[PDB]
Design a protein around this ligand. Sequence first.
Ligand SMILES: CN(Cc1cnc2nc(N)nc(N)c2n1)c1ccc(C(=O)N[C@@H](CCC(=O)O)C(=O)O)cc1
Ligand SMILES: CN(Cc1cnc2nc(N)nc(N)c2n1)c1ccc(C(=O)N[C@@H](CCC(=O)O)C(=O)O)cc1
Ligand SMILES: [Ca+2]
Ligand SMILES: [Cl-]
Ligand SMILES: [Cl-]
Lengths: 159, 159
Amino acid sequence: MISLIAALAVDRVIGMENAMPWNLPASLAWFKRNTLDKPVIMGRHTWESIGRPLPGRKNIILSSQPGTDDRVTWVKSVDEAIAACGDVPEIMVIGGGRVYEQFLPKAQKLYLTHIDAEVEGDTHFPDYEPDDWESVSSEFHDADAQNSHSYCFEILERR
Amino acid sequence: MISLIAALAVDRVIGMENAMPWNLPASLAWFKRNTLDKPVIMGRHTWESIGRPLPGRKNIILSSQPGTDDRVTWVKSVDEAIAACGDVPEIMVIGGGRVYEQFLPKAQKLYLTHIDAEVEGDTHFPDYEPDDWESVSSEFHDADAQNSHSYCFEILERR
Ligand SMILES: CN(Cc1cnc2nc(N)nc(N)c2n1)c1ccc(C(=O)N[C@@H](CCC(=O)O)C(=O)O)cc1
Ligand SMILES: CN(Cc1cnc2nc(N)nc(N)c2n1)c1ccc(C(=O)N[C@@H](CCC(=O)O)C(=O)O)cc1
Ligand SMILES: [Ca+2]
Ligand SMILES: [Cl-]
Ligand SMILES: [Cl-]
């Protein structure tokens, strides 16, 4: 089963190349809890933003360019990315924009962090029609001394 | 000698009701570089924001109320805070507003990270006379895969 996991600001803006303007450790912990022990597929920009292989996860990079690093798996296509994950119960797609566009058709679950921040951006998370998706769980949290903005975790299942 | 180290957004903002809306690992690395192996004096609210004692530094908290963590030294006056530093060459004051207000008149140097972020702040760095300080180093960086805003590191010496 293929799942997409993303953090969206107002209007579905998502990061593209530069780091996003927020500091949300509670949300990164949620990202960790939900991707640990599973394979993660991401594009080149995400991988440069992360800065190293996420531990406890099989790191798969989907890019047209070559593999700088040997601690992860470099693949040139969707089928190849899918294949490198082997047979597992759940494959996590962690972005960015293009990658999400490529897997959305095949996705069965969406884990999203909705963040109350207005950010000017080019890239948007794909339009997903919530009538094609059932929201199953939602949990809001206010900003605090450690989290810059209010955020809401949402899980949706494809119907 | 006492030095002040601060991160200022536009208009000298240094704090907000919640965590600052930025992700700047390169500035944190500069802050560690410049405070490592030194005593650091901070107020209670800055301590609470940090979450734990800073490693490799003697952490001193200036507060009127009693201490809640045995890992650090709690002090009730400027004089006590200084004294708790012992005999070292340089004492670093890490904020917040009021604490910077009480040490500025005794400071000979300032390490400032200026960040291009326009935000509404709650506290601000005390007003410094640009005719009383000499900029001895400056270094500009744009936002990147890991840093959400452009920033500039500056060190000033009291004329
Ligand atoms: C830039 N980036 C991609 C990123 C960040 N937050 C997201 N949040 C959501 N919900 N979804 C994503 N796809 C997402 N992707 C990052 C950056 C750092 C780490 C990271 O260091 N994670 C540690 C957790 C905290 C830590 O130890 O620093 C982990 O083990 O996953 C993860 C993703
Ligand atoms: C919120 N806060 C206060 C803070 C942040 N940046 C500043 N930056 C400057 N220039 N000056 C300050 N006084 C300042 N203070 C923090 C928060 C975290 C860490 C911290 O974890 N720094 C680690 C380095 C980064 C890391 O290990 O994650 C360290 O060892 O110093 C420091 C200060
Ligand atoms: Ca100069
Ligand atoms: Cl990407
Ligand atoms: Cl404080």
